[PDB]
Design a protein around this ligand. Structure first.
Ligand SMILES: *C(=O)[C@H]1NC[C@@](C)(O)[C@](O)([C@H](CC2CCCCC2)NC(=O)[C@H](Cc2ccc(OC)cc2)NC(=O)[C@H](CCO)NC(=O)CN2CCOCC2)O[C@@H]1C
Ligand SMILES: *C(=O)[C@H]1NC[C@@](C)(O)[C@](O)([C@H](CC2CCCCC2)NC(=O)[C@H](Cc2ccc(OC)cc2)NC(=O)[C@H](CCO)NC(=O)CN2CCOCC2)O[C@@H]1C
Ligand SMILES: *C(=O)[C@H]1NC[C@@](C)(O)[C@](O)([C@H](CC2CCCCC2)NC(=O)[C@H](Cc2ccc(OC)cc2)NC(=O)[C@H](CCO)NC(=O)CN2CCOCC2)O[C@@H]1C
Ligand SMILES: [Mg+2]
Ligand SMILES: [Mg+2]
Ligand SMILES: [Mg+2]
Ligand SMILES: [Mg+2]
Ligand SMILES: [Mg+2]
Lengths: 222, 204, 195, 196, 211, 222, 224, 198, 195
């Protein structure tokens, strides 16, 4: 019988700074045990300073990112060049996803940008459009490997002040863009080591008030 | 259905400078229902430590079985079993039930009393030996532990440090697993002495 | 068991005469060669219902074509079959060979297997009995044979397919398409079995 | 399922067991004792598949009685639970496993302490302050996580049961026809006849 | 794990904050209460998308009722829109268990349980989700009509903590709401992480854990 | 897994990758798949890892006993007949797939065994998820009358095709060379082309970071 | 939902300094029977694009008709059909990618893997893959069926990453492709000796090579 | 299933209907009224699938209430039962049938006689002296077969139910949380508020 | 694809050289003609595991036969294969041709299909590729051919079976059984494809 879904592997990771946000993914695309591409980008600049990745079944990923980019173009036409706030993006994607509730997009999607107060923001979505804003989130094949590390090193979970008898929690003092990239690169060197569907390339898109910058790093190719 | 997913539970072992460490959660559940907050998964036979994860009736049975086999060993050999040897006994004991196996993921830790070399190993339920120098992970949050250990672990950690590293790897991986947590215990093993510490952790 | 072969004077079409329902022979003297125009024939293999429904629709399409645009090419006849078999592939179990003679391109043979694909060929074999005669047909087919050699090649080929395939039997019917018109040939067991 | 509770207080173990026996559409009996005395200071309650339940209880009873006469000695509660778990642990990998869950409430005359053992049909043994088998657990565990103290008298422990049995009469879909209650303490096993 | 109960002092609403994908813990920082209007709360349990999308859609339909009839929508009529919606999707595989909790002058304080099966029930006490039984356990054995706001808030909090502890598929934190004549008041987010130890000490309960 | 056998003019070499996986997860980044049945008869397996290891040790122990009993060097056709007859008895329920190479008094040999108890023979063989990638390198570069240095090069390059193009295979290359004259030589980590890059950050926790309820010394002695 | 009947095996492809190369054997299999030996699975569109198709051959002939129509349609009211507004590889690919994904979404797929190889009007090499699920990717080497398993490993030794494409000549790349086709004949049971090859070079244009054969096979080692 | 009882006496019809509503392992409510007033002298009790039960009841109610205003007149119990039977008999061959069983108890002011109709989800209708739906009938029919008389007073009718409910509280496995009891007579519909110990 | 043919001199046995795991070729150059005795050979088709395991047991039984009672007949070798295949029919997927030569009876060919039945035949085809050469083999075989005629009849036959069947390929090996003894013959693609 024909099966309308596949799994093209890969992994994504959003982290929110005070006045910036990063969305990063690997650039590897796989089927079963074969590599399709070592460099097939998966994170996208959709404009109005929003970046988006729809990781999972790459076909449902490409259809969704396509339909959102078109939502952004028609929002400009229909509302006199007004800028699509990240919160408004999120809700629009909810409707995009939920419209296919009984034949879903097999993707876990994240978006990053700035809210209307200039603070960094990360929204993440289940395949049928459940969504929530968050400080950080990893999605895809290695999500179960990285999310625990993010809890520990981004949100300081299970960590306390030395010699306070585990009564004073470590304060949430917040991360610089240099420090966030360090955690992202380690998060991917780790996933690449322990997940066979992760490697080849790491693409990071950084969103500040001055726009969208891209960084690229090699990863192991086994 | 899946015997390895009824009760839940996790074990992890790490090596350090002249020392090993082994930790487990304390949860014993029946699917969604947590039942006991006091079910230890780490046991010892002399100076060889075994953690077990999986179906809790097999965790109990295997412990009783290795105590039996290690007691007879000691009476005949006139010395305690060593980690390298115990690992081979666990391996062969599991492969013996090949077409009816114990639904467990065992983990051995200890220091060879002669050589003083730190040693850890892990097994699948039919007894394949996974011998790594760095760390060994098992249970319903094995995915999360793999990611926590890979990131956090550096070689040649002093016992005091290794204690923070294994504790942080367990706590954070357990908090991302429905079927693990409900308290944890951590053994810090050196040639001469062994310290056992209960960790404060989220009780949900 | 059905086949068409492209020779010097035109093209030749042959078939067994068996209609079966399981292992019961329903008719042992059926005619599986059906005319679509004056010089264009089809050979039917598969479901009796599915093949007969299709042949009737193609016939209609070529009678309407003729009324409007004069004589259709053999290629055209094949394209109508292909279109029906391709678009209804979920509900059809038909294998069809199409053989035609005009004065421009002389003899042509087209084959439309289960999927709905079209294959132009010097000769085509099809049906259950065909599996047994691939080796024979491939070692024995030549281009630019005579009418007498081509009838011989097809008589022998189908003879072996009837012998080996329990889903084939009876008489061998043939149709010869040349400038001169349409010639109907029959060969009975007593002639072809002793080859 | 049938209702099987137990709770260990300061100086005793209390077992509460439902009195209903139902087959398809009819309650056949409303006064059923889902308990066997294993030895004068050890009591086992049980619930599960129809015949298996008593057949397993009586087989254990016979064996512990035999041991008593042979050694002219009463096995500790720890020893008896260990015996029962091993029988079930064998049973699960046999041709037709015993489908029976049990609580073992005992008073250890050596240590002068009550002990409550919860054991499922897989041979999953654990010692608890309070325990339950089947759907009961879902209501009674969080209830007793609130209202249980370790130094409670036998009287405070009966009150604590009344509170569990009312919650289950209110919120559980099965009419289980109330419970028979037994106390296991230093003087042995007695039945509270007046829980109605 | 969500609950709502009615008492002398209005309505108490308490919910956990955990999202699961089987045995994977997806989040501990989730809102399970929709504030529909200053006098109407909806609770969410079941499919994450199904709850969020249709309780947001209820929010729109309620606003549309205010513009049309120049009158705040009744709890009865709000529960019945969601009820009638859900009933059209019956058999299709929607999954939601929800309490519509609100105050109108006409009805007084009112709670409607509505579930994806079509069931619509008025009542004083509901608990909804995988954790419901754990919550009922504590709630049903401490409930009176005559509790103080302070004591009713606590019982609601203490009943979610209970289920957060036992139910593997509940936890994170307790969100508390109080619904009066003057509308809903939010009584804060309580991380089970720190709540459990503060309660166990102060209350002397949870004796089963070593601490 | 990727394993290859290559015959050369005076013996036979085998080679394997060093990656062990639990589903999509890399369990051991460097595990030795190269086992000895006897001094000059080596083994490499794929399929159920407990079955390959277990079946290797059983035939290895029986071969030792048989050797002592006949006062003769173990022969390869013996290890072959014993594996074959054992795997066949269990109807493929023992998920063992082996390449066995070795030298003995009769010459040098290269065979393969499948779970059902089928055997193969050839001048070049391969097995595992990396089978097809390795076989493509072998089919392209193999010639008759290979030297030792050429057969190591060819077998090593076949394992790389696996490491790089197969998700089931990676890390380093193990090689065993068995020449008719000399002792079998085992080159653990012959190639290490997948070294982890130095991390961006040290994750050493300040001491006392973890909350401890209860402490106690454990008694190991009497 | 269908099942493929008459089917074609691996299409293999790679890009080199100045263009792209693509090849595919001339076989139409019918299960295990090697039925049709005259089948072209390389479809040239204009003079800057070749489309290689694997899988169901009837669905291939449908995609053949769709591409001829696309050439016709593009000529309509287009006095620049042979200049600035000729069809591109990127244009032809994006159409097929659209159509494949619609057909999977209607649960009635075209049971194919397609590689579109070409040179764009600005000289850039174009190589991209789409199949029955609507899944798409690019890589300096692409292959379908068995060729993903055997050809890609061999062609990746010549071009591992993007930096190697300006270092690879037509000679080196064509040689790699003919070698890969030989290996596939050795190890793919549904393969043929007779194959077609196409080169799209930004200078010499489209070279389309018919009736090629795998030569220089090693079988001699067999006799022992 | 839930408990749906009806019994026709001399001058009235008495419907008795379980107060329990149970999803899975939790009794959600213990005071459910499984009945809608269709007209001032016609009452319908119902049990079946979670959603369909009330949706069907309230739909019938609306239609009968509409008919009443349009004709300014109350349909006979016989007429209401025939309308309801036909609605179900359509539902049974529709895409998703209403899985709802009903009793209709009414007093016909033209005939001056009480009437009890039992109708299953297929559109099977019958007039009975006493009726039941679900497992309840396995006990009550043989009970009433013994103790029933057609000339009984409404007071006797209620003792005959108290005898049916005790038998069900004894022998059935479900806790159905007792019954709500309604009388339909020449004077309309009233709820017997003291059945908790009558 | 495997066959044996009975000629004047003695008997010839032929096979392709293909071992496959689905559409993957595991071995393209495998020998499927194994000796049971000095001048008795078997040709194997079916499961690799099942045919090897049975070939080894037949061999063991004929080595023991020879020790005690001397030279076994071909009939005797066929009989042991039959015995195994029949009595273990529920667990075995093996189709076996047995061809041998002694000085009284000369050349003999036995065939043992899936049943476990035995058939003595002038020539025998078997394996996936045989279906395509039934017509060709029936039409081209006659009694009392020479060694060279018989080597040609087999060469052409397996050539066809390889060309059409995707489950068959590689080299044609043959084994010639005469008074002289055993002669091994191999034929590579570049020879047999251009027939
Ligand atoms: C050579 O290769 C011949 N092989 C023999 C044969 C008989 O199978 C057949 O294909 C022949 C084709 C001609 C076509 C022109 C009409 C006469 C027959 N086929 C049949 O005779 C056909 C067998 C068949 C049935 C069904 C299917 O697929 C569904 C394939 C083949 N016979 C029938 O259909 C009989 C006709 C009774 O009048 N009906 C049934 O078997 C009833 N079945 C219908 C399908 O559902 C199951 C019941 O000739 C070729 C050339
Ligand atoms: C108390 O009883 C809580 N127990 C926790 C929990 C998680 O089970 C749940 O029921 C919760 C309801 C809340 C979650 C937070 C948003 C508001 C609603 N449900 C989930 O978290 C939900 C579980 C679930 C999945 C599937 C189904 O059947 C379809 C029922 C429940 N999680 C999800 O839906 C995840 C979200 C994060 O990944 N996503 C998916 O399951 C995606 N699949 C959904 C089904 O369709 C295919 C895609 O809270 C109660 C109150
Ligand atoms: C001519 O007709 C040839 N056609 C080719 C072929 C392959 O079918 C075969 O029968 C050939 C026979 C030789 C005999 C001498 C020993 C080598 C094999 N057979 C195979 O190659 C065989 C195919 C096969 C497998 C299974 C079954 O039924 C269960 C029938 C045929 N190959 C294998 O068995 C490979 C061996 C790998 O070393 N492995 C598998 O197929 C894997 N398992 C098979 C069981 O199912 C689970 C997977 O030659 C004839 C003459
Ligand atoms: Mg990797
Ligand atoms: Mg947890
Ligand atoms: Mg238990
Ligand atoms: Mg929990
Ligand atoms: Mg072939």
């Amino acid at each position: 019988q024909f099966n309308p879904y596949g799994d093209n592997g890969g992994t994504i990771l959003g982290i929110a700074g005070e006045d910036f946000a990063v969305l990063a993914g690997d650039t590897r695309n796989i089927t079963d045990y074969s590599i399709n591409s070592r460099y097939e980008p998966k994170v996208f600049d959709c404009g109005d300073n929003i970046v988006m990745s729809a990781n999972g079944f790459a076909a449902d990923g490409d259809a969704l990112v396509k339909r959102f980019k078109n939502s952004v173009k028609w929002y400009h036409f229909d509302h006199n060049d007004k800028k699509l706030s990240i919160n408004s993006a999120a809700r629009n994607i909810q409707h995009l996803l939920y419209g296919k509730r009984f034949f879903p997009y097999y993707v876990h999607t994240i978006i990053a940008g700035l809210d209307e107060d200039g603070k960094g923001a990360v929204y993440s979505f289940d395949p049928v459009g459940s969504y929530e804003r968050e400080q950080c989130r990893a999605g895809g094949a290695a999500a179960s490997l990285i999310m625990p590390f993010l809890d520990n090193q981004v949100n300081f979970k299970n960590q306390y002040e030395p010699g306070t008898n585990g009564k004073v929690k470590k304060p949430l003092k917040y991360l610089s863009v240099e420090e966030v990239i360090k955690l992202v690169r380690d998060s991917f060197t780790s996933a690449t080591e322990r997940h066979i569907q992760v490697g080849d390339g790491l693409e990071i898109l950084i969103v500040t008030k001055d726009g969208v910058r891209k960084e690229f790093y090699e990863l192991k190719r086994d | 259905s899946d015997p390895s997913s009824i009760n839940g539970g996790i074990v992890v072992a790490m090596t350090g400078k002249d020392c090993v460490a082994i930790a487990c959660d304390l949860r014993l559940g029946s699917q969604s229902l947590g039942v006991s907050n006091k079910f230890e998964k780490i046991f010892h036979y002399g100076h060889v430590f075994l953690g077990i994860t999986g179906l809790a009736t097999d965790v109990t049975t295997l412990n009783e079985m290795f105590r039996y086999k290690t007691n007879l060993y000691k009476l005949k050999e006139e010395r305690a079993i060593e980690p390298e040897t115990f690992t081979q006994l666990v391996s062969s004991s599991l492969y013996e039930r090949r077409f009816g196996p114990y639904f467990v993921g065992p983990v051995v830790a200890g220091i060879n009393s002669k050589s003083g070399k730190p040693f850890i190993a892990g097994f699948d339920l039919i007894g394949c030996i996974d011998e790594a120098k760095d760390f060994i992970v098992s249970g319903t949050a094995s995915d999360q532990l793999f990611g926590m250990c890979e990131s956090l672990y550096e070689p040649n950690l002093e016992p005091e440090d290794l204690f923070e590293t294994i504790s942080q790897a367990l706590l954070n991986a357990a908090d991302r697993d429905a079927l693990s947590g409900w308290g944890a215990v951590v053994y810090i093993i050196k040639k001469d002495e062994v310290v056992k510490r209960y960790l404060k952790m989220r009780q949900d | 068991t059905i086949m068409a072969v492209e020779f010097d004077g035109g093209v030749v079409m042959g078939s067994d005469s068996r209609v079966s329902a399981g292992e019961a022979v329903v008719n042992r003297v059926f005619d599986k060669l059906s005319p679509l125009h004056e010089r264009i024939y089809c050979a039917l293999s598969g479901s009796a219902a599915d093949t007969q429904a299709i042949a009737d629709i193609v016939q209609y399409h070529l009678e309407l074509y003729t009324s409007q645009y004069g004589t259709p090419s053999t290629e055209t006849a094949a394209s109508v079959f292909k279109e029906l078999c391709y678009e209804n592939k979920d509900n059809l179990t038909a294998g069809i060979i199409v053989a035609g003679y005009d004065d421009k391109n002389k003899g042509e043979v087209y084959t439309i297997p289960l999927g709905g694909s079209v294959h132009k060929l010097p000769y085509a074999i099809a049906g259950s009995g065909s599996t047994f005669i691939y080796g024979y047909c491939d070692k024995n087919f030549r281009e630019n044979m005579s009418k007498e050699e081509t009838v011989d090649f097809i008589k022998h080929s189908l003879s072996q397919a009837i012998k080996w395939d329990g889903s084939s039997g009876g008489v061998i019917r043939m149709v010869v398409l040349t400038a001169a018109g349409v010639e109907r040939l029959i060969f009975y067991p007593d002639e072809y079995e002793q080859l | 399922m049938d209702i099987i509770l137990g709770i260990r207080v300061q100086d005793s173990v209390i077992l509460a067991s439902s009195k209903a026996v139902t087959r398809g559409i009819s309650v056949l009996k409303d006064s059923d004792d889902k308990t066997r005395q294993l030895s004068p200071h050890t009591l086992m309650s049980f619930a599960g598949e129809a015949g298996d339940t008593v057949q397993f209880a009586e087989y254990i009873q016979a064996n512990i009685q035999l041991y008593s006469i042979r050694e002219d000695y009463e096995l500790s509660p720890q020893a008896v639970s260990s015996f029962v778990r091993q029988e079930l642990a064998k049973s699960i990998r046999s041709r037709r496993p015993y489908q029976v869950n049990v609580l073992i409430g005992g008073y250890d005359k050596k240590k002068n302490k009550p002990e409550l053992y919860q054991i499922d049909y897989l041979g999953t043994k654990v010692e608890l302050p309070y325990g339950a088998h089947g759907y009961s657990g879902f209501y009674t565990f969080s209830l007793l996580d609130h209202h249980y103290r370790p130094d409670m008298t036998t009287e405070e422990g009966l009150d604590l049961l009344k509170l569990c049995v009312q919650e289950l009469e209110k919120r559980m879909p099965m009419d289980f026809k109330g419970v028979i209650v037994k106390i296991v303490d230093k003087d042995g096993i007695r039945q509270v006849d007046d829980f109605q | 794990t969500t609950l709502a109960f009615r008492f002398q002092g209005g309505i108490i609403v308490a919910v956990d904050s955990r999202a699961t994908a089987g045995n994977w813990v997806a989040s501990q920082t989730v809102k399970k209460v929709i504030e529909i209007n200053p006098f109407l709360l909806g609770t969410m349990a079941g499919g994450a998308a199904d709850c969020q999308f249709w309780e947001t859609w209820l929010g729109s339909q309620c606003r549309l009722h205010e513009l049309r009839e120049k009158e705040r929508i009744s709890v009865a009529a709000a529960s019945k829109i969601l009820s009638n919606l859900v009933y059209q999707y019956k058999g299709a595989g929607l999954s939601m268990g929800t309490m519509i909790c609100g105050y109108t002058r006409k009805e007084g304080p009112t709670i409607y349980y509505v579930d994806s099966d079509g069931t619509r029930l008025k009542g004083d006490i509901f608990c909804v989700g995988s954790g419901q039984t754990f919550a009922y356990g504590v709630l049903d054995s401490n409930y009176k009509w005559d509790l103080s706001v302070e004591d009713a808030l606590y019982l609601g909090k203490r009943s979610i903590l209970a289920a957060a502890h036992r139910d593997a598929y509940s936890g994170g934190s307790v969100n508390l709401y109080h619904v009066t004549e003057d509308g809903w008041i939010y009584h804060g987010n309580h991380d089970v992480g720190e709540l459990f130890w503060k309660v166990k000490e102060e209350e002397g309960s949870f004796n089963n854990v070593i601490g | 897994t990727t394993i290859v056998g290559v015959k050369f003019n005076n013996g036979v070499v085998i080679a394997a990758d060093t990656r062990s996986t639990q589903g999509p997860i890399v369990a051991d980044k460097n595990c030795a798949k190269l086992h000895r049945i006897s001094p000059k008869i080596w083994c490499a397996g794929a399929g159920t890892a407990a079955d390959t290891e277990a079946v290797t040790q059983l035939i290895g122990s029986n071969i030792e006993l048989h050797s002592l009993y006949t006062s003769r060097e173990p022969r390869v056709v013996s290890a072959l007949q014993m594996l074959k007859q054992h795997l066949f008895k269990y109807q493929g329920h023992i998920g063992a797939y082996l390449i066995v190479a070795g030298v003995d008094p009769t010459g040098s040999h290269l065979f393969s065994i499948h779970a059902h108890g089928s055997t193969d023979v050839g001048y070049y063989l391969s097995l595992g998820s990396g089978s097809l990638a390795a076989m493509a390198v072998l089919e392209s570069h193999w010639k008759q009358d290979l030297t030792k240095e050429e057969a190591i090069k060819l077998a090593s390059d076949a394992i790389q095709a696996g490491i790089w193009n197969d998700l089931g295979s990676g890390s380093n290359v193990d090689v065993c060379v068995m020449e008719i004259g000399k002792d079998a030589e085992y080159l653990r980590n012959y190639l290490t082309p997948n070294v982890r890059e130095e991390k961006q950050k040290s994750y050493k926790f300040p001491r006392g970071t973890t909350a401890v309820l209860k402490e106690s010394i454990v008694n190991i002695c009497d | 939902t269908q099942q493929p009947i008459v089917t074609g095996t691996s299409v293999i492809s790679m890009k080199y300094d100045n263009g792209v190369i693509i090849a595919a054997d001339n076989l139409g299999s019918y299960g295990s029977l090697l039925r049709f030996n005259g089948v072209e699975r390389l479809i040239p569109v204009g003079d800057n694009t070749v489309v290689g198709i694997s899988g169901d051959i009837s669905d291939m002939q449908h995609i053949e008709r769709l591409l001829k129509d696309l050439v016709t349609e593009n000529a309509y009211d287009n006095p620049l059909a042979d200049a600035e507004e000729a069809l591109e590889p990127s244009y032809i690919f994006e159409y097929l990618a659209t159509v494949m994904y619609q057909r999977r979404s209607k649960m009635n797929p075209l049971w194919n893997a397609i590689i579109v190889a070409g040179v764009q009007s600005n000289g850039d090499q174009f190589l991209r893959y789409v199949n029955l699920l609507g899944v798409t990717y690019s890589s300096p080497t692409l292959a379908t069926g068995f060729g993903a398993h055997m050809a890609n490993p061999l062609l990746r030794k010549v071009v591992d990453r993007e930096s190697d494409i300006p270092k690879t000549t037509v000679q080196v790349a064509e040689e790699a492709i003919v070698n890969a086709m030989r290996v596939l004949y050795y190890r793919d049971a549904r393969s043929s000796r007779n194959f077609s090859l196409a080169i799209i070079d930004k200078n010499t244009g489209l070279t389309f090579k018919k009736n090629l054969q795998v030569e220089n096979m090693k079988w001699d080692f067999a006799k022992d």
